Structure formats: C-alpha cells, structure tokens
From a paper:
The small-molecule PD-1/PD-L1 inhibitors of Bristol-Myers Squibb are based on the (2-methyl-3-biphenylyl)methanol scaffold. We show that they act by directly binding to PD-L1 and not PD-1 and effectively dissociate a preformed PD-1/PD-L1 complex in vitro. We further show that they inhibit the PD-1/PD-L1 interaction by inducing PD-L1 dimerization through PD-1 interacting surface. Not only the inhibitor partially covers the PD-1 binding site in each PD-L1 molecule within the complex, but the interaction of the two monomers fully occludes the PD-1 binding surface thus preventing the interaction with PD-1.
Having confirmed the affinity of BMS-202 towards PD-L1 and its ability to dissociate the PD-1/PD-L1 interaction, we crystallized the compound in the complex with the target protein. The obtained crystals diffracted to the 2.2 Å resolution. Four protein molecules found in the asymmetric unit are organized into two dimers with one inhibitor molecule located at the interface of each dimer (i.e. the stoichiometry of the BMS-202 : PD-L1 in the complex is 1: 2, respectively). The inhibitor is located roughly perpendicular to the dimer pseudo-symmetry axis and its disposition does not follow the symmetry of the dimer. Both the binding site of the inhibitor and the intermolecular interactions within the dimer involve the PD-1 interaction surface of PD-L1, providing a rationale of the mechanism of action of BMS-202 (ie. dimerization related occlusion of PD-1 interaction surface). The inhibitor inserts deep into a cylindrical, hydrophobic pocket created at the interface of two monomers within the dimer. The 2-methylbiphenyl core of the inhibitor anchors at the very bottom of the pocket. The distal phenyl ring within the biphenyl creates a T-stacking interaction with the sidechain of ATyr56 and is further stabilized by π-alkyl interactions with the sidechains of AMet115 and BAla121. The methoxy-pyridine moiety provides a significant contribution to the compound binding including π-π stacking with the ring of BTyr56 and a number of polar interactions with the A monomer including the carbonyl-π interaction with the backbone of AAla121, the anion-π interaction with the sidechain of AAsp122, a water-mediated lone-pair-π interaction with the backbone of APhe19 and the water-mediated interactions of the methoxyl group with the sidechains of AAsp122 and ALys124 and the backbone carbonyl of ATyr123. The extended N-(2-aminoethyl)acetamide moiety of the inhibitor provides additional electrostatic interactions, but only with the A monomer (and corresponding C monomer for the second inhibitor molecule contained in the asymmetric unit). In the case of the PD-1/PD-L1 complex, Tyr56 of PD-L1 is rotated and rearranged towards the PD-L1 core, while the Tyr56 sidechain ring in PD-L1/BMS-202 complex is considerably moved towards the inhibitor molecule thus creating a T-stacking interaction with the benzyl moiety of the latter.
Numbering used by the authors:
A (entry chain C): 18 to 142
B (entry chain D): 18 to 141
C-alpha cells in the first residue's frame, strides 16, 4: 500500500530565509524516474510538476517563478524535497505534495512565515 | 501527456437533490483496472479512494457515508463520475478528482447548493 509520509506537518520560517519541506515516498531498489510524477502546489497554485524525469513550469504561478526547485538528488532517496528561496509572507499557507510512483498519495504541509514590521507593512499594503 | 479534463467545472444543485460530477481521462483501448487510481475529495475530506480496482469502503469520510459512490461502469469510458445523493449545504465547495493512469493529473470542480430557509439552518 503506497503511502506518502511527512516528517514535519508544520514549518515555521523567517521572512527572507529559504526552506526545504519534505515528502517521503517508498523506493525499493533504484528509482525509476520514468514512472515518477511529483506535483507540488500551495492553495491550488502550482509550484513544481515533475513528469518522468523533467520539470515543466506549464501551470506554475508567477509568485513562485525563479524561486522554487525540487532537489532531484533527493528523489532517488525517496525524498520529494521542495526548496523555496527568499521566503515571502505570501508563501505562508498549506502545501501539497502529490506523488505517483506505482501507486499514488498526497500529504499536506503547513508553512508559517514570521516577519518584522517593515516586511509586514509592505505585505499589508 | 496525461490530462484529466472537466467539461463542466461548475454545478448548481438543489438541497435534497442528487448530483453526478464528472472527470474525464483518456483510455486507449480496454481499461486496465490494475493501473488505475481514482481519488475524489472536497476541501481535504476523502470521498472516494479507488486503488487498483477496489473501492476502499471503510476510509470514506463520515459526512459522505452512504451518499457517495464512484460509477464503476463509467471508468471503461474514461469518465470518473462521482454520484452524490441527498445533497446537503455542507456539500457546497471545491471538489477535486485526482486520477493516476499511466500518468497523473487532477482537476477542480465547484459545487453551489441552493436551499430553502429551514435547511439553511444549518447556520446553527
Ligand atoms: C490522500 O489519500 C489517498 N489518496 C490516494 O490518491 C491520491 C492520488 C490519486 C491519483 C493521482 C494523484 C496525483 C499524483 C501526482 C500528481 C497528480 C495527481 C494522487 C495524489 C490514494 C490513497 C490514499 C490513502 N492512502 C493513505 C495513506 N497515508 C497514511 C497512512 O498516512
């Protein structure tokens, strides 16, 4: 029974930092990239789409353009690792990793973004 | 590549009525149940978990128990098709059909529920 697992449901992130949120999936022996699909999104806005070896950007949101990448190395360890650079308050919310690999599942991750007044005022207006 | 499509992404349903919301996915010749996974949910509540031929009857969310089922005959046609009976105001919201079949994709469907005053409470 194919189960995606998350070591951390919740990340607390400082504005301007970078984060890597992780989804684990079973890999017996060596990853077959041709059978792997990974979607990452937040609030039905798309971040990563990894179909049989390559990312696509085809339904990606601009807010994440040039800021998000999936660590390909980690896939062969069974780790779907999403790195977001230069975290913005807009990045707070609920992420989903959807994984299809001879079986399919998905998990939610909640991200909380702390920021000081200057950053928060800009976001507010 | 593999695309789930929704001809109709908006349903307007009457309280107490029935609805059938549909997602299409391509089938080449004969359907292969072993490769097929169909998952249906609404704003993070499980409705249908159909894995390699078998509906998992015991994982359905309580508020949908005995009201929701996947029309298995429609899969042979490349139509997921979630049939919901005795529609409640709680049924309004965004549904998702997630489909894996030699490829994977998902789509959103919005449901609105019309209801008379008495039903609308609810509300308390
Ligand atoms: C969300 O639940 C499930 N969802 C399933 O289907 C999800 C699904 C189905 C079809 C396609 C996709 C998909 C995959 C990649 C990209 C796009 C869609 C997904 C995530 C199947 C079984 C389950 C139940 N497994 C529970 C195991 N988790 C535990 C024990 O923690």
């Amino acid at each position: 029974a194919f189960t995606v697992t998350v070591p951390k449901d919740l990340y607390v992130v400082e504005y301007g930092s970078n984060m890597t949120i992780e989804c684990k999936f079973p890999v017996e022996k060596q990853l077959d990239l041709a059978a792997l699909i990974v979607y990452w999104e937040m609030e039905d806005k798309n971040i990563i789409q990894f179909v049989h070896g390559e990312e696509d950007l085809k339904v990606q949101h601009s807010s994440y353009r040039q800021r998000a990448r999936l660590l390909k190395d980690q896939l062969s360890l069974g780790n779907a690792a999403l790195q977001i650079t230069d975290v913005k308050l807009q990045d707070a919310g609920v992420y989903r990793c959807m994984i299809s690999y001879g079986g399919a599942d998905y998990k939610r991750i909640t991200v909380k973004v702390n920021a000081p007044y200057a950053a928060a005022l800009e976001h507010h207006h």
